[PDB]
UniProtKB/Swiss-Prot annotation, chains A, B, C, D:
A carbohydrate binds at residues 45, 64, 73, 81, 84, 138. Changing residue 43 to A: Abolishes chitooligosaccharide binding. This is Galectin-3. One of its GO terms (cellular component) is extracellular region. The lineage of its organism: Eukaryota, Fungi, Dikarya, Basidiomycota, Agaricomycotina. It holds the Pfam family Gal-bind_lectin. It comes from the Eukaryota. Induction: Induced during fruiting body formation. Homotetramer. Oligomerization is required for carbohydrate binding. Changing residue 45 to A: Abolishes chitooligosaccharide binding.
Length: 163, 163, 163, 163
């Protein structure tokens, strides 16, 4: 199932993500440079998110170009964000013009891939299945990807012969 | 290679399409109803196109909802369009929420698929390789797909094990 | 649909191959050196075949290592083969140790691929859908592939998302 | 990378399996009826194994048709197997006549799939990368699969576009 995900918007999946589902976020541009304008916020941050029916952010994926890092986290609806889990940003992107972030669902954790190469395993923190995805950025900034992304949801059986 | 193709725009491929290349046009919405407003033009038409370096339209794919048909054609740069080749529109789309148009290149013709089911073989008319793709509609109308499409270019070797 | 195809045997398909079906013959070995022994025919020949319900060989694909070329033909049941259609063997295989022959069906012709690169388009000569495949060799010789091949039958939709 | 795996034999891989590698064991047949004969062991057992460079069985996957379950274990070279880990056999196969067992590698564990549906996560016990695979059966019995299996080694990137 394909979805069009515009910058600063949220899109509903067609159904809750089943066990071992796979979500691919596809860009047609790469920009690893700091945003021209920092904007009111004061922090260079663009992110994609997996959200449940209640509005909780099961997985938050932030790209911090001025900090050279990927920030993973979870955010209960209307509450503060938990402890951050970070890893270096350099050396993950930069190999192709259409960068992508792939998420592989497992019972207790999320497998995260950059341009199809696993870079981290994030332990789940909040309850409930993914039913929405969002693409957000702090006011006045410019993203590290195209301002519109292609999002595909599929299962291993799909990318293998048969129906 | 993934590309983001916005309504009423043209995007350059990263390189001329090689023999037996495959181009997939992906929408996340389907609307088989006549456009609300016909607009100045007076014809309900939305189309996608394969274009060469010189600006000639090697393959034109128009969807005519009020005529219940698919119109295939070619258009030399700055010249009149040739003879139309048409087939019924009903029964091709309507099986899924994310409709797609796939084009399979062959030496002398283009294999055209709707939602991955072949519906026609169009004989090539103009010379030169595909290097651009466009998504167009007549002024004031609303498309039968999302106003942004995902376009992927690949080769058979890609969708099969190995590198 | 996967099938095991042993040298000098014929295997039935699950059902008649439908329009645009794809058949992939996989080997885990490549040996382009000519067969040491030639047996009673005096001609180095190993072939794979697509057969219809009444015994007609719809498409015969031979590998002639002593003549540097592929040989394509059709053979009505109980009759003699028709005219041969050839292309060079050199420059097709070579870039892998697990070679494959892929046939992509079309209304009036067969698209043939070596290691997933199209090398020829064979115009159909007989009627009826393919219902069996075979792997044969001339008496007393050794083949250029493993003595057992993996055969997969699928369709374009199977290698693309959802449904 | 494709490999032919005959019953009661061991086959080497092209190179040590890298992080996140995927190994697919394919059969063209399914027979869950118990083996008519049991031979000297008196236990109906057919298995597939992932082996390292020094003879250690990193992962042993057994099918016990008389005990209704899969048996997972590890076996250091020259030593005795460790504790068994089981799950029911019933309800895993069944929806195809060409069954497959897929192993997806992870840093600390193996994700196991039957017909492309995850059924278990086995925690690694031994060191070293997988360099060989084998297909074995207890003396005098007949297996639940074809006597020859097709084995494919690949990576996630291989089943996704470009590079």
């Amino acid at each position: 199932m394909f979805h069009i995900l515009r910058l600063e918007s949220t899109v509903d999946l067609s159904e809750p993500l089943k066990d071992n589902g796979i979500i691919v976020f596809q860009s047609d541009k790469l920009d690893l440079e700091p945003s021209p304008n920092l904007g009111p916020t004061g922090i260079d941050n663009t992110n994609v998110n997996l959200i449940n029916a209640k509005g909780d952010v099961l997985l938050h994926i932030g790209i911090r170009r001025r900090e050279n890092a990927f920030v993973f986290n979870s955010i209960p609806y209307g509450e503060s964000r938990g402890p951050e889990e970070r890893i270096p940003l350099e050396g993950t992107f930069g190999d192709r013009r259409d960068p992508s972030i792939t998420i592989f669902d497992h019972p207790d954790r999320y497998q995260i891939m950059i341009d199809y190469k696993t870079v981290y395993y994030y332990k789940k923190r909040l309850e409930g299945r993914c039913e929405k995805v969002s693409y957000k950025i702090n006011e006045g900034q410019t993203p590290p990807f195209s301002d519109v992304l292609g999002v595909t949801v599929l299962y291993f059986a799909n990318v293998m012969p048969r129906a």
